[PDB]
Amino acid sequence: SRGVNKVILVGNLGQDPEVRYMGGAVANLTLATSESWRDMKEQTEWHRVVMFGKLAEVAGEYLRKGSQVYIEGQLRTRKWTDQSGQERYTTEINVPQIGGVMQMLG
Amino acid sequence: SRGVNKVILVGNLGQDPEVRYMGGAVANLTLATSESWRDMKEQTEWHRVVMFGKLAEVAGEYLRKGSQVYIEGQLRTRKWTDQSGQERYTTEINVPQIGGVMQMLG
């Protein structure tokens, strides 16, 4: 490991977490961070978040469509093909099994 | 204002910073974070970083291709339509001119 790749988020799940398996468990969820402007104009940011193992497993048993959470992980930009067939890029927040934290807040 | 959007990075640039103007000065650069894991794989992450104003113009005079730098900012995913006319999204680490940090290391 050479450099630092850390992202801290406190925000609310926009929708329920989606947990899948392959045989490790994966959980995807989207949280929001807001800020306020006055010319009241808000600005919500959506954060593609993905967790693995127990952390994923816990997210399923307890996280909901409004739950608030603290997340520690690293930026990871992954490539994929769209139906039109061109490799596209989506940047998510990886929450590593060893090194990443998540916590429900309430 | 409402939630916590925070990201911390320590890594080295891949290419000389790109500074332009509008409006106040804007500076784009990309830096690398590397990692190692078993079953030894090296996966370099590349991070689109953008600063404005005082930070930007400083980045120009001092930062070059191999420099190490510390970064504090927030994630920002912006939406845009391309030339062929499909929607695309880009996720950057915005270094707000108010509250964002940058430091050269050595």
Which residues of chain B have a CB within 8 Å of the CB of A77?
Answer: 45-46, 91
By what technique were these coordinates determined?
X-ray
Pairing of strands B26-33, B4-13: antiparallel
Chain A: residue nearest B45 by CA?
Answer: A76
- The DSSP letter of residue B55 is H
In this structure, the strands spanning B26-33 and B18-20 are antiparallel
Residue type, A21: Y
- Residue B95: closest CA among B47, B52, B31: B52
In chain A, where the domains are located: 7-104
Tell me the two tokens of residue A99: 């090194």
Per-residue tokens: A49: 């978040």
Q: Which of A12, A33, A75 sits opposite B45 (nearest CB)?
A: A75
**Class of the domain covering A7-104:** mainly beta
Backbone CA torsion sign across B56, B62, B67, B68: negative
For residues A33 and B4, is the Cβ–Cβ distance under 8 A?
yes
Contact by Cβ (8 Å): A48, A30: yes
Gap between the Cα atoms of B73 and B5, Å rounded: 8
| Distances B50 to A26, A87, B25 between C-alpha atoms, Å | 31, 24, 11
Q: Do A75 and B34 touch (CB under 8 A)?
A: no
**Data resolution in angstroms:** 2.9
Contact B1 A77 (CB under 8 A): no
Q: Which residues of B touch A45 (CB under 8 A)?
A: 5, 74-77
